[PDB]
Design a protein around this ligand. Structure first.
Ligand SMILES: OC[C@H]1O[C@@H](S[C@H]2[C@H](O)[C@@H](O)[C@H](O)O[C@@H]2CO)[C@H](O)[C@@H](O)[C@@H]1O
Ligand SMILES: [Ca+2]
Length: 431
């Protein structure tokens, strides 16, 4: 995409801590949330769930004709419901303005005006605080890393002159088709409006890359998940390479399921939740350690703190069936997927060693708040598939009838998440 010139871009300031030093940085909104308009007029190129066919009769013409504009200081709050102070960021769910309603948001951490911060997680400990108390069933306040390009794609894709400054270049291990710009071009060819999301659709291409989920959660359930792909960084896909949901799920370039560590799914139902060992009614500290040895990454450990108290990760609780693993390791991934009867695409795509190489190349930090128009967040917090009760189907305490976006957007529009005190540094000991 080209950048529009109606509104100077403002990145929302955010402080964090890197290797013992305070860093005065900022966040940027993902290009998918921006005003996309004619290069010569205020006419929208994209509105609602469809492109304007006069501006966008084909992808190349759309790319020539359309531009993504800036988000000014006031618009963060008034349109997207996003605020920051010090090292604290709050994202909102439903925000209604004079003219429009926004649902959720996705932001990236910047290094400077034109480049994302690049995290090299190997042999490091990454921590933050989160308040998930205002996230019901069907919501996800997420913090994660993806193998996006540092510059958002400007060096790779000459038609992307907007770049990381405008939040371009999102990819993840879902190979999403809902991206409006992929590979520097409008993804307008083959566009189909969503069945149930008035603001979204899908185009022919998807945007794939490795993904390390630190925190996918609401007040009822939480997980952390490693997803490896067989492709090198940001990779557009078409056709079966995208591994689309349904029949193609295991045929593409990325591992959609990932190797997940989700305490409730692992038989530890009282560990996290309202009044749990880790009480989701109160802010908590989430600590993640990327342990390496001669084989590269070999373990992803989790520690919590709450109220000053260290709380070790809850171990797998299927006595006699699965060993009491308490972290992501290769053996865990293999054994748990056998017990759950899940296809091990994680290993097919390179396993822990592939994941290690992905982390070595660096990742971009993402924070988001969303509902799930495909699967109602049931994979996170309910039973999924809804018609199974085999081990691994149960994910959390929420109903199989929960999480429809038309329910949650109407019944809990005021949902929010707050992330704070983001930090990276050497691996610490917790006794
Ligand atoms: O929908 C986004 C979510 O997908 C999961 S994979 C998920 C599948 O939806 C389900 O078919 C499979 O059987 O269970 C898993 C849940 O672990 C992905 O892991 C996650 O990181 C992503 O945000
Ligand atoms: Ca210490």
């Amino acid at each position: 995409q080209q950048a529009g010139t109606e509104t100077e871009e403002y990145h929302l300031p955010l402080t964090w801590e890197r290797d013992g030093s305070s860093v005065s940085a900022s966040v940027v909104i993902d290009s998918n949330w921006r005003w996309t308009h004619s290069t010569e007029d205020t006419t929208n190129c994209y509105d609602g769930n469809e492109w304007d066919s006069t501006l966008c009769p084909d992808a190349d013409t759309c790319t020539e004709n359309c531009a993504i504009d800036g988000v000014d200081q006031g618009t963060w709050g008034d349109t997207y419901g996003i605020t920051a102070s010090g090292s604290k960021l709050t994202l909102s769910f439903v925000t209604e303005g004079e003219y429009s309603t926004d649902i959720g948001s996705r932001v990236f951490l910047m290094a400077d005006d034109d480049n994302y911060e690049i995290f090299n997680l190997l042999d490091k400990e990454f921590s933050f605080d989160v308040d998930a108390s205002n996230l019901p069933c069907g919501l996800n306040g997420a913090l994660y890393f993806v193998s996006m390009d540092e510059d958002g794609g400007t060096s790779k894709y000459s038609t992307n002159t907007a770049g990381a400054k405008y939040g371009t270049g999102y990819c993840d291990a879902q190979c999403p088709h809902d991206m409006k710009f992929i590979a520097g071009k409008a993804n307008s060819d083959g566009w189909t409006p969503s069945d149930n999301d008035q603001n979204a659709g899908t185009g022919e291409m998807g945007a794939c890359c490795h993904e390390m989920d630190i925190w996918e959660a609401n007040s009822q359930a939480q997980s952390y998940t490693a997803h490896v792909c067989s492709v090198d960084g940001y990779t557009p896909c078409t056709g079966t390479d995208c591994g689309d949901n349904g029949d193609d799920r295991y045929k593409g370039v990325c591992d959609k399921d990932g190797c997940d560590y989700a305490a409730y799914r692992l038989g530890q139902h009282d560990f996290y939740g309202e009044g749990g060992t880790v009480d989701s009614g109160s802010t908590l500290t989430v600590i993640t350690q990327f342990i390496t040895g001669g084989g590269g990454l070999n373990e992803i450990r989790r520690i919590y703190q709450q109220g000053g108290q260290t709380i070790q990760n809850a171990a797998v609780n299927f006595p006699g069936d699965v060993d009491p693993y308490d972290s992501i390791t290769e053996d865990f991934c293999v054994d748990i997927k056998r017990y759950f009867g899940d296809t091990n695409d994680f290993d097919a795509k390179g396993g822990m060693s592939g994941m290690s190489n992905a982390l070595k190349k660096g990742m971009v930090l993402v924070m988001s708040l969303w509902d799930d128009h495909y699967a109602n967040m049931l994979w996170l917090d309910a039973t999924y598939p809804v018609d199974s009760t085999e081990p691994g189907a149960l994910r959390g305490p929420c109903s199989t009838d929960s999480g429809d976006p038309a329910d949650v957007e109407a019944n809990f529009p005021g949902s929010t998440v707050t992330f704070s005190n983001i930090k990276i540094g050497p691996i610490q000991s917790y006794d």
